[PDB]
Write a protein that binds this ligand. Structure first.
Ligand SMILES: O=P(O)(O)O[C@H]1[C@H](OP(=O)(O)O)[C@@H](OP(=O)(O)O)[C@H](OP(=O)(O)O)[C@@H](OP(=O)(O)O)[C@H]1OP(=O)(O)O
Lengths: 207, 207, 207, 207, 207, 207
């Protein structure tokens, strides 16, 4: 990553074994459950494009997913090139990043450091991270196991467990249905609650 | 988080994998037992709003709870806007944070750093943390399993185990009842103790 | 905690996840065995009152104990107020800490930092830690399982195992009895040893 | 490794136990699955040739592989010597690295530091790392268990699991075949999709 | 401990949770096997007397041992007082440490820091550590399970396993006997070896 | 160890609990398999003689081995004395290290720091480490379980597994035999390969 040092200057630091291992095990244990996205974002804090590629490439499984992510990345890089075309460079001068440069495939670590620490800085790490998260959200939605239409409170299911399933599914797929899909008893209670009830009030009512 | 460096200046540091993992596993293992609140508070020491959202969003389960927390957060943000309305910004000048800015949803990391390190500083991280803890306390109370009225010393239950259950329940729900709910033998001893007895004296008496 | 930095100035640092986890697991595994006291003291090295409350409040069990500790703390705070009464503050000036300020319940983190780093410093963290350890010693003594009078060497118990139990119990409860409570054979050997024998000499004699 | 310090100067730091252990366990658990290559690259961030030899030599198993890697390394060193022949050195002056110097077998740590921190720097660590990764890719390909021709969707295999196997195998071996090797039902769906379908569209179609 | 900082000045640092846990688990797993002594010495690198007492006091078991250690410590403190008697102190001046001061029982942390960082420094941490290791060696010898006279090579015991037991026992208790206690076959081989044989030569001979 | 600080000066740092534990567990798990040597070398990066003795002495088992290592060390120290005899020292001046000084048995930590940070520096840590590794290689060879002559490919053993055993054994003991010891089928294939075949080509041929 790029991080600030005691002297107050942005400098490159090696990605730590703890971060690498953390990402790899997150993916191993959670697959593409939605909460893996914020974790990724936090673990790639300050990441260069090289670091983002390191994190993605250290994943051993889910290679269908990783190829889909390559597709998204290439699409976003093509659009970047459409918006920001690039014009031999002047001796010793910063060149303009193209899509494959932001994705870290045609740019060196040193060039990425130069862009990210330029004044004004070109945050190629954050732009690339945005593309990656776009692709990852596509994957989260794709691997969502169940439709919100199929989450219905069981006849003996505590209302809390049902709401947990409901908003877990809703998060993967990225509230009147909540009442509609409740079971008869709770549905009666919630119908009686009236309009404008908070989720807190509903969960207390069916407790 | 924002933390002080050797030069004595407040600077942003990436949230560490150890902190993220610690929060996630705390929630996995303890759910919303009351002691999870102080842990959260300590793990979010120095947190920006972005960091607080990272911690909350990396939780994969308890999505009913997390939605309730969103409700509380939005309520507090609305009140903040009621008290501190906001007035294009002057070029290069700090803008005033609104509720969604303090919650980290309409503000950037850089803006949050600027507020938190301004002189005088606007501690958006601490204000947001306060809202979050308010919501979390609502959740702790909601998920409290048992009423203090139903904690009664068993006929063979050591007094210590009963007091542990009593104050654990009291903490979740957020002392004469202690004697009232004791079993006959201990209740006789404690009645004989007289008024003004410390908990120490009561636990020794029924030991 | 408050710790010294490279510049040689006392500054506040966030309590680390390793320390929090260490305390919580210490309590989980050892309950109030006496050795938990020194561990606490070491883990709270440099602690502000806020940090001490964090450590105590992250304990989920033993809530009878924690309430007793609150009682001790309040007693010590009352005595502090008896000895050091407090007299609106002068603009921008340090106010005098009262008992609840030292216990971290009516004082802010910033005020605690100011006291602890003042010249001369008011070590509210160490004063509070003293009160906490007083209460904790009360708890260790209370939860001591056995009286030293009931520790007696078994007819086939190695003398070493008996001495281990004897001084473990003595430590919880906070040497001629050692001979008295030894078994007949070892008791004969130790009686023959004569007066003034070191524990080493006694353990070798009955080896 | 060589890393930047607060003063802004490149200095040598000892390889950490966490990095060593991480590499050793990566190899123990994953053998030469392709994702071990990026992990290696990240764990050897900033590595001197000495550090690279340390990482390779701490591997206890797979000694056939490690010998093959020695062969590749020696080949690349021979080519380096072919391109950059070396000409007693001038007193106190930097000598020119030869192949065995870049591989860390005839050069000292101090010489490697001098090359890597020279202005202009001679990045012997990165050149050597390139040779090592070339050999390692040869090994990944060699130990690839299955030909892409033998990855065919099972009659009841979810399309996702089949694509995962397909691109895992393709990665080890280093898309119309994807349709060709799909099972009859999915193959019909994908044939109907028409040309130009993204992998996302194909996986949704056969979901 | 006391350690050097970037400014080059000796300053006090809190004992780390990793060190505390390491010592406690070392004792839990190895009891007083001889190798626990060097580990202690290394874990108490730079330790103040307070730190040494922390390490000793966090041990929950082996309280016979810990009392014996108190006896040794008090003996050494008495001798220190015999050699270095102490003479109200001059205002603001360093006082002379007595035995109980070096053992950390009548001296404050601040006084210990002052002694250890004085010019010339009075290394109370190292003196105390010496006393502690003296007592600990007494304990290692006491808890040694077996006499070297009773270590004899079994009729089918590999010579290596026998030598391992022999020097393990010798280390606890703190070479012609090696041949004498070997079994008949190996004893014949070693007798034939002649005088002046290295342990290497003996182990190869009986391999 | 001795390591460079931010100010750019070589200073002593305490050996870390992670390094100590790493060495101890390496030895516990791998005994004297050859790969333990590079690990040792890396874990003792920057080590003083005191640190090397700490690492060796914290090993609880393999005391035959450790005594043999003492023998090697003493031999090398005797040779050092033969080559570099030593001549009361001049007040305040650096004395010349003798063999037992380099082995850390007659020299203090402070003297070792002085030698290792002198200009020119006397690298007693590296000289001693060399002696230690010489002894350790003797031990690796001694504890090698099998002769290379006894490694022969099984009639159903994959060629890869056989080469792994072959070069593992060769490494412990410190290529035409490879063909000679292969099984009949693979031996025919490799004989047909002709002269000059790389190990890669041989392993592919018998795959
Ligand atoms: O490999 P790293 O990511 O750099 O981890 C280190 C390491 O922590 P762990 O070994 O516990 O992961 C240090 O531990 P030491 O062995 O040096 O003691 C610790 O320093 P502390 O001893 O002060 O805990 C430091 O933590 P800190 O950030 O508080 O300096 C932490 O670095 P990260 O926190 O960046 O992981």
């Amino acid at each position: 990553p790029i991080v600030q040092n005691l002297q107050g200057q942005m400098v490159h630091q090696c990605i730590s074994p703890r971060t690498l291992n953390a990402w790899v095990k997150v993916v191993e244990e959670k697959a593409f459950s939605p909460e893996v996205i914020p974790m990724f974002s936090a673990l790639s804090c300050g990441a260069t494009p090289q670091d983002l590629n390191t994190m993605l490439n250290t994943v051993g499984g889910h290679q269908a997913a990783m190829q889909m992510l390559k597709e998204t990345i290439n699409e976003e890089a093509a659009e970047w090139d459409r918006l920001h075309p690039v014009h031999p460079i002047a001796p010793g001068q910063m060149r303009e990043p193209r899509g494959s440069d932001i994705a870290g495939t045609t740019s060196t670590l040193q060039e990425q450091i130069g862009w990210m620490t330029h004044n004004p800085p070109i945050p190629v790490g954050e732009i690339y991270k945005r593309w990656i998260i776009l692709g990852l959200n596509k994957i989260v939605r794709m691997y969502s196991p169940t439709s919100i239409l199929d989450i219905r409170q069981g006849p003996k299911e505590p209302f809390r467990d049902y709401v947990d399933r409901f908003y877990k599914t809703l998060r993967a797929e990225q509230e009147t249905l909540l009442v509609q899909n409740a079971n008869p008893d709770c549905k009666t209670i919630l119908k009686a609650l009236g309009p404008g009830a908070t989720l807190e009030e509903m969960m207390t009512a069916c407790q």
